[PDB]
Ligand binder design. Structure first.
Ligand SMILES: [Ca+2]
Ligand SMILES: [Ca+2]
Lengths: 223, 223
């Protein structure tokens, strides 16, 4: 997260870190046994860590659970990043509590102009790389599709939404990916991509979760 | 390497990749059993890979050897990055050949104005992150200490040198670190640090190898 702020400890309880001997992506806990992430975050073996604040320090709220089933959206298109969504069924249920809680699937597609919360342990710099210890927060609005499309000529699909600022300086970056964008307590997006980070005119692109509620449910059910 | 070019296959034979289940730093082969790198590149277990071009493809010239002794400069100062130099004695000698060759230690400190060659599998973007497959090359001059210091008020030590362009767009970036900067066939620097990457007025800083010839020799000898 570039230009964000350090989240109040255990304020983003649905926030999960996709670990593989290093933190490489984020995700959201949608139920005691399921995490939603980005298909570009796929790995054959993943350790999902919940209740994390400081990814480098054992603070005592952490729950570490192996991924059992890692299921990418079947129409995942690595070229375009269309359907860049994946589900992870944990090997066993987590203990929901104060710092290990779930987030609601979108009831509706949120309108442009809605204020969302983006979180992650993603790069925090606009140029070069800096990986933070503490989870980072960012308040940002959902931008009108027109601007999205304007920023990314012919690359925005209907399952993509831009969130951020046209002016730059504030954005999600590498490492935040597969991470959540929550609006009015519902998961509306997933950290997807953008050109550079926090660059003026280069809004961050996100997978539009409201386009997959069915898929998510069906899959969860079927597994 | 930002704004560099793809090196002619096996043109930088002294170039090594510090692997730990992923490429994380570069280094130089100074002899059949020794690699010089950056202390900030230290890890308890390292796999040194030589004869690499495409870090993701087995092309048949690769030699993969475990690090036996990983020795950081004793005055390594993690805070300032002073003495950011480390030696790796391989577990066994490599087969020197056409794409697995050594580089000379500096006979003298190279003057400002000298053209060097910087190489690495380091980030290739000025904003965001992109890891290349093929080794990247960069021709850049050694800048006058005055400019170095000017770019980094009170952070440049006498064992640091700036190399690059004040205008930006061309530089070393994260992942190039511990990597070589060769001038007239001698190793004059090690990829160290800089603010962002390829940013105007933010030259890359490098460890001045000519200040450690003795240390290198003494250590090599002593081990
Ligand atoms: Ca922790
Ligand atoms: Ca190779």
């Amino acid at each position: 997260i570039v230009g964000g702020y350090t989240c109040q400890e255990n304020s983003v309880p649905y926030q999960v870190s996709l670990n593989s001997g290093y933190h490489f992506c984020g995700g959201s806990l949608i139920n005691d046994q399921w995490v939603v992430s980005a298909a570009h975050c796929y790995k054959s073996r993943i350790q999902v860590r919940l209740g994390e604040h400081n990814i480098n320090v054992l603070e005592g709220n952490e729950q570490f659970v192996n991924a059992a089933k890692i299921i990418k959206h079947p129409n995942f298109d690595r070229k375009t990043l269309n359907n860049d969504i994946m589900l992870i069924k944990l090997s066993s249920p987590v203990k929901l509590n104060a710092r290990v809680a779930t987030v609601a699937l979108p009831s509706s597609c949120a309108p442009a102009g809605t204020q969302c919360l983006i979180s992650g342990w993603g790069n925090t710099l606009s140029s070069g790389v800096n990986e933070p210890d503490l989870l980072q927060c960012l308040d940002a609005p959902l931008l009108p599709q027109a601007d999205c499309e304007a920023s990314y000529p012919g690359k925005i699909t209907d399952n993509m939404v831009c969130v951020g600022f046209l002016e730059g300086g504030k954005d999600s970056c590498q490492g935040d990916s597969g991470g959540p964008v929550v609006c009015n307590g519902e998961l509306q997006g997933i950290v997807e991509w953008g050109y550079g980070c926090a660059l003026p005119d280069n809004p961050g692109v996100y997978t539009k979760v409201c386009n997959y509620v069915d898929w998510i449910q069906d899959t969860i059910a079927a597994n």
